[PDB]
Amino acid sequence: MKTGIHPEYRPVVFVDTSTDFKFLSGSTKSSSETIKWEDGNEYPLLRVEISSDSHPFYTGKQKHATADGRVDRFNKKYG
């Protein structure tokens, strides 16, 4: 790498806010937060929504089979 050319790139801790999955990796974005995970170092905190720790393709995925569509609705309305 050169000087001055590349953008600020630094080690940053992602956290899945669905299940608090913590994970260090380099990036270029604070999200205005800092922690001292993995004692001996400061790291900014790039909080995030769903991660691989929680995605249904990597986990269970049968959810959201809620209705068959118009049919139970008919039968629920008229018995």
Binding site: P7, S25, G26, S52, F57
Partner: protein
């Protein structure tokens, strides 16, 4: 070096006890990753590179090179020498970090992420996908993207065949 540590710790022994190599250096590695936008819109506007270059550098962590046309084409209204898209080569710590970020954070952010095609192999042992829409990555905001475009992601390997490549990427966490 989360995933490099992981690699040398678990996958090299596992993968070599699977494919039964005659030495420790036959074992595959990732040589590199190559990200490429592929812009053709730049024939008619200069602001498009001004978006895409900054956006790749944010997604990636080092400046992209604007690639140019090797030859002139009238069906695209394309003169030789014009700037067409940009690319980045990621190697070492930053390719490992890019895969970390990728599988951990960004691949799930896709609309209906049910993995990616296992058949997408060049035949020589390398892999390519394409992020349809760069907002999938966290380093960039959606409110900055005037107009979405995708980019090819090439994961290059020292693997001699599709099988070894797929097992490497399965152990690293590519669905």
């Amino acid at each position: 070096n989360r995933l490099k540590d992981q690699y040398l710790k678990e996958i090299v022994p596992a993968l070599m006890s699977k494919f039964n190599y005659d030495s420790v250096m036959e074992v595959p590695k990732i040589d590199k990753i190559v990200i490429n936008t592929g812009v053709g819109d730049a024939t008619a506007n200069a602001k498009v590179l001004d978006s895409a270059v900054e956006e790749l550098a944010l997604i990636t962590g080092q400046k992209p090179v604007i690639t140019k046309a090797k030859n002139s084409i009238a069906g695209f209204r394309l003169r030789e020498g014009m700037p067409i898209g940009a690319k980045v080569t990621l190697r070492g710590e930053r390719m490992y970090d890019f895969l970390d970020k990728l599988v951990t954070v960004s691949l799930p952010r896709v609309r209906d992420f049910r993995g990616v095609s296992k058949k997408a192999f060049d035949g020589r042992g390398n892999y390519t996908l394409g992020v349809r829409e760069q907002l999938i990555f966290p380093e960039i905001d959606y409110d900055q993207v005037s107009k979405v475009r995708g980019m090819d992601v090439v994961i290059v390997t020292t693997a001699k065949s599709d099988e070894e490549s797929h097992e490497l990427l399965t152990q690293l966490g590519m669905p």
